Amino acid sequence: KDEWITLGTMGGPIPHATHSQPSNALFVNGHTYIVDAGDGTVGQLTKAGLKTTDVDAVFISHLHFDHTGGLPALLSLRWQVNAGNELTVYGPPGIKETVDGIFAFMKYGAAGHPANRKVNVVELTDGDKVSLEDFTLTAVRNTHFSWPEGSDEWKKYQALSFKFELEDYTVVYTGDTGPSKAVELLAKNADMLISEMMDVEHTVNLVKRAHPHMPAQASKHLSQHLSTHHLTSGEVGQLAANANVKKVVITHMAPGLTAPAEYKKYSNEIAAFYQGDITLANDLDRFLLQR
Amino acid sequence: SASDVKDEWITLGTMGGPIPHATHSQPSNALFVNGHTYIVDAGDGTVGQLTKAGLKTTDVDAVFISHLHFDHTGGLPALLSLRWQVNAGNELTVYGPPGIKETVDGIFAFMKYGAAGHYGVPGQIPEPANRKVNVVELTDGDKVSLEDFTLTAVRNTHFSWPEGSDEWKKYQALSFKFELEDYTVVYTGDTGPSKAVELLAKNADMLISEMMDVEHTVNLVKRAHPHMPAQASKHLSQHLSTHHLTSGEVGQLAANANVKKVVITHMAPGLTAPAEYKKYSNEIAAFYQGDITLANDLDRFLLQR
Numbered sequence A: 001k002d003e004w005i006t007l008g009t010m011g012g013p014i015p016h017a018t019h020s021q022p023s024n025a026l027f028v029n030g031h032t033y034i035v036d037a038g039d040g041t042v043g044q045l046t047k048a049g050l051k052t053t054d055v056d057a058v059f060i061s062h063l064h065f066d067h068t069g070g071l072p073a074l075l076s077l078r079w080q081v082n083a084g085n086e087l088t089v090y091g092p093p094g095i096k097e098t099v100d101g102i103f104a105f106m107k108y109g110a111a112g113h114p115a116n117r118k119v120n121v122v123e124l125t126d127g128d129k130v131s132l133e134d135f136t137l138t139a140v141r142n143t144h145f146s147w148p149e150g151s152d153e154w155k156k157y158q159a160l161s162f163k164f165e166l167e168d169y170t171v172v173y174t175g176d177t178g179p180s181k182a183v184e185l186l187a188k189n190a191d192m193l194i195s196e197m198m199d200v201e202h203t204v205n206l207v208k209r210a211h212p213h214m215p216a217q218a219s220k221h222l223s224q225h226l227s228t229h230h231l232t233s234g235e236v237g238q239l240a241a242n243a244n245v246k247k248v249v250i251t252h253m254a255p256g257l258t259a260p261a262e263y264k265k266y267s268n269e270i271a272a273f274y275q276g277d278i279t280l281a282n283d284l285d286r287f288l289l290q291r
Numbered sequence B: 001s002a003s004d005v006k007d008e009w010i011t012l013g014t015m016g017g018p019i020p021h022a023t024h025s026q027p028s029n030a031l032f033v034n035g036h037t038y039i040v041d042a043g044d045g046t047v048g049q050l051t052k053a054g055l056k057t058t059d060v061d062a063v064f065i066s067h068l069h070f071d072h073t074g075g076l077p078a079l080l081s082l083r084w085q086v087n088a089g090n091e092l093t094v095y096g097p098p099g100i101k102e103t104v105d106g107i108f109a110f111m112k113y114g115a116a117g118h119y120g121v122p123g124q125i126p127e128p129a130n131r132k133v134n135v136v137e138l139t140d141g142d143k144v145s146l147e148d149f150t151l152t153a154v155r156n157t158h159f160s161w162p163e164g165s166d167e168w169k170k171y172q173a174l175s176f177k178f179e180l181e182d183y184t185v186v187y188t189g190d191t192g193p194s195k196a197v198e199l200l201a202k203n204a205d206m207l208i209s210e211m212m213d214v215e216h217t218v219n220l221v222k223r224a225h226p227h228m229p230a231q232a233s234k235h236l237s238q239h240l241s242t243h244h245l246t247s248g249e250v251g252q253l254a255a256n257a258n259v260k261k262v263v264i265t266h267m268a269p270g271l272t273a274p275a276e277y278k279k280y281s282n283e284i285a286a287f288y289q290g291d292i293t294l295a296n297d298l299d300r301f302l303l304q305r
């Protein structure tokens, strides 16, 4: 019935052959929603048996392009088939300017055959709650960015985590975040935690291979910034344990996993902190939103 | 035989049109010459498909857009923005028909705010979203001399604007000829029957052509819009027939051009069953005597005589 589908499970903008870019489908009361829209979200929702014309709203955690790369495809292709249902894009500050740019990308091609037909944009800031018919949503600023609280950057540039309160189910999606007290509170006693994860040193070691002249200082600072802005396996389990969630689903995993040994390593590392049902998601996995 | 790079066309996404299919990703192609990666049309999921084909976003040197319909460009925003996010070091050139400049500029506008916010670290250096991209507008008859091939672009019959008119100048759909050192490959892009395309394809080693079952395509459009008026679907049928290639027009094209082999991509609706493959390949074969292949996603075709 109601379902979460992990459409793309890769973390970060370095694409992977068997882990598609950040993309999720939320299916509630027969209605289709998208949560983050990396490249290929249209292809992936179709593989999951869903329809592009059925998308009623998109929810954007933050403006990194591994999370928005596929939004221009979703909007323009809906336009091209004259989709008839209204679509609303939710996102942090700057999502309005971002979507407006999509209309500018569309403009000339659409004129050849308006681009903003049947598209509404809502900007969310920290603590906003929005009541829709199928669920209640809460957005909170997390620790993915390091702007000093109170600065203009801290207001202008936010990364959000999402709580979706269904009639009889609560699921928390971290988006990209480091360890965060806000996220810990938001996820209190949730039925399902859908969380990011990273192997920091493996991510760094791949980048050093692809940049063989990277100085020692530059990869060291990459390492610390990644550890500040993403969740390690231990931190996932600690967040799951502290918030007392009922089940944990890992997506946005970097690097991409391919072998049972790897799955065992990371699942057991989470299990040092959290004793529950733990799933490392694959593309097109479906999770029943039912108590 | 496994050692050393080969020159290849990879049909990354083989679907025709903007109605997505579970097993045919959106129009996308890779042209891989002298170990350099080029993209020819860039529907949604182009980044995902080139990665599946063993290529990397950071190796893409140029993109060639045949026309500005969104089943052919909807993935280009992802290709440019994902390359910017990893600080790709090489210059990327986007070629396309008139309007490709305004379209790429909109991509940079879509990128602006995420690019400014970047990774959220105080002291980060600003870098423009348009870093290391240039855009070349092509028009009918142009030839571009690159080191790895000579490109010719010609206006085809995908659009029916009257010659001379404002729209005929503004809106063009292109077919491409790529002349490599020892091989010629012609890419129809989207087109109806077209003498210009037939002439461009003359004696080509390989023709990469679109194809369409018009009445089945119409049926899918009707199911998508169940209140479409009867005259509208009748005019849609007439429009698709003159602006796309039926299986018989594909065979006539390949035969009148005398191409050495034909490869069908951009096929609408998507095919799933061997009876379908037998039907359509035989309808092409009724006119064309050479080698025929109906491509699948990630199929690779060697650019060697």
Ligand SMILES: [Ca+2]
Binding pocket: A011, A012, A013, A022, A064, A066, A067, A176, A252
């Ligand atoms: Ca991310």
Ligand SMILES: [Ca+2]
Binding pocket: A062, A064, A144, A176
């Ligand atoms: Ca991010």
Ligand SMILES: [Ca+2]
Binding pocket: B016, B017, B027, B069, B071, B072, B190, B266
């Ligand atoms: Ca097309």
Ligand SMILES: [Ca+2]
Binding pocket: B067, B069, B158, B190
């Ligand atoms: Ca077209």
Ligand SMILES: [Mn+2]
Binding pocket: A011, A012, A013, A064, A066, A176
């Ligand atoms: Mn990331």
